[PDB]
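User: We ran a pulldown and think these components assemble together. Before we commit to crystallization trials, I'd like a predicted model of the whole complex to look at. Sequences follow.
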Amino acid sequence: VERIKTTSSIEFARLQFTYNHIQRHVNDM
Amino acid sequence: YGTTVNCIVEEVDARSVYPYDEFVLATGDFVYMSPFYGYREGSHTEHTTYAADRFKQVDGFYARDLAPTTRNLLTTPKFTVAWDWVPKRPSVCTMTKWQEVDEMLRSEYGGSFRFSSDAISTTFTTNLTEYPLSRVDLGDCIGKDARDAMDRIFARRYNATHIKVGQPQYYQANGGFLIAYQPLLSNTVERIKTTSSIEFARLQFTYNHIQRHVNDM
Amino acid sequence: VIWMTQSPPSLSASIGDTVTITCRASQGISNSIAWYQRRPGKAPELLVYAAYRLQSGVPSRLSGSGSGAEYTLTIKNMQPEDFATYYCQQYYDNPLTFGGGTKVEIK
Amino acid sequence: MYYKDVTVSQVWFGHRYSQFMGIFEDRAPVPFEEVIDKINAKGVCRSTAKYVRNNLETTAFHRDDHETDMELKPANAATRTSRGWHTTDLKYNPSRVEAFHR
Amino acid sequence: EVQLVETGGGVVRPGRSLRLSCTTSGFSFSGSAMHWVRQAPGKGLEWVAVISHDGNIIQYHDSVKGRFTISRDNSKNVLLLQMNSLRVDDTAMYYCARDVWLLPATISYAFDFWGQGTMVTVSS
Amino acid sequence: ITMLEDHEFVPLEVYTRHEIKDSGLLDYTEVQRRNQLHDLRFADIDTVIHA
Amino acid sequence: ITMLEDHEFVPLEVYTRHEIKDSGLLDYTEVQRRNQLHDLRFADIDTVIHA
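Assistant: Here's a predicted model for the assembly, 681 residues in total across the polymer chains.
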């Protein structure tokens, strides 16, 4: 049993999503 | 009337902040004296507030079962803090190693250096002029930490394909970052203030990656 | 200051022989050593840098090795144009220091 | 801030050498008239402090002498200290008399 | 072809300064760094000074702190070494060693081609 | 035409909230906690002496 | 077809750590520093009177 620690700063995930969206679009087109 | 005396010895951890003029203790009571104040190595130039009679230093001091070293004691009006004396310059530094990038590409474009780190997805922008280490206050440990990190990384990964070129180069990037840089060849005085978020650099790297890709294609 | 100890100070080998020379350091320099030779009456020329890299024109028989604070220059099948003084120079830190020097005179 | 650090200490003077028995440190306000007349204009302050502690009116005389107006003087400069002021630098303690709680 | 012609060496009694200059024929300034290395009689080589490709990076040996000055003029391809208060121990064969070229703008602290030498002695 | 390669954005902060909290010289709750363990540790809060 | 122009992302934050720390009314470190230097500044902690 253990307690996980969030890193805060969801900016990493937001940039991950933005890059994923842009990359998916540009790759497809 | 009735009195009581309880001699108390407590092993607390003290803390000091730049310019290390005084240090706090775990009990919440200040000591108005530089932690590195002493007599050897020109330590008397450090700032202290208590008179010299209330401070004494012992060389060759061994602890108690409760390698002798120096001891730096003091008598505040309430207690007597004691801590072993250490040389300030190698003991403390005003810059902390943040990340060790195994492969950080360096490029020059538009009169600036664009240190792009694909490993951590972060691009910094710095001037062409190498930042002198003398300009950094108490930054001697920066060189030691950087050299140790680069030697470890080179031995672990790059000794079979790449070689180093000269002494490491130091550049100061936007946002208050110092990038100790060691170029590789394939075998084929002031205190700098750092921003609280690397969001600008991460966005710069993401935009650069997307822009180079879309521009090229 | 990084101290170079290019031992032994002198050796002797004939044509076609093999010879090894050893350079030590006061502390680990991480492959940041350079090997220099001077033909009699000639200016120094670079032979090895990064402790295992050979420039253009250097004979393939010459080769550097070692790591940390130990670096050895090994010459196999020495020709007549290979008997000269050799100097090991580090460039890991400052100030730059050179080796004591080794001599290889034909017997 | 215009306050008078009214502090009183009870001291045991033993058969051979002295000893404390309590130091009542207190911060006391000063009258508006005192601030206007003596503090701002004349730059001095009284040796008494009329103030209300514990739902009771009390005065303390500096050094327990008669009323006088000390000349307010700047405090000694320490590290990272702004401009402070205080009339007295030392702190009065009772004269040593044998076996008396003074 | 690379040629390091260097002059300005001569006998100087101890006490005052001296000037050394070097001329480069094949090696091009502003593209490679230059060093100064001395070789005292009876001893090995010894590093003294280095100047960057443009001149903004200057490093000196620990024995020439505040006594030696290095400068270059990329226009005439001449490297200047100015030393002050030269002592007796400075008697050495001063070569204008050129730093090896590995990357466009980097000082590698390794000497690929050396000068012939020049007589610099301090006797009384 | 080549595809834009996938990229993983690892979490990255200049200063974590833990070191931001520790940046202060004196810590609020830690100082209070030590000053209140003072009595409990260096003295007995249960023994009663009657005479 | 025109190339996407280069863009520079300057550091940006409405609340730096310094002003975030200063947002609080009272800072324990500063308050304790002032209160403990009060004795030194407004009294003599070395002079000894014996009579």
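Chains G and E do not touch (no CB pair under 8 Å). That may be worth checking against your pulldown data before setting up trials.

User: Thanks, that helps.
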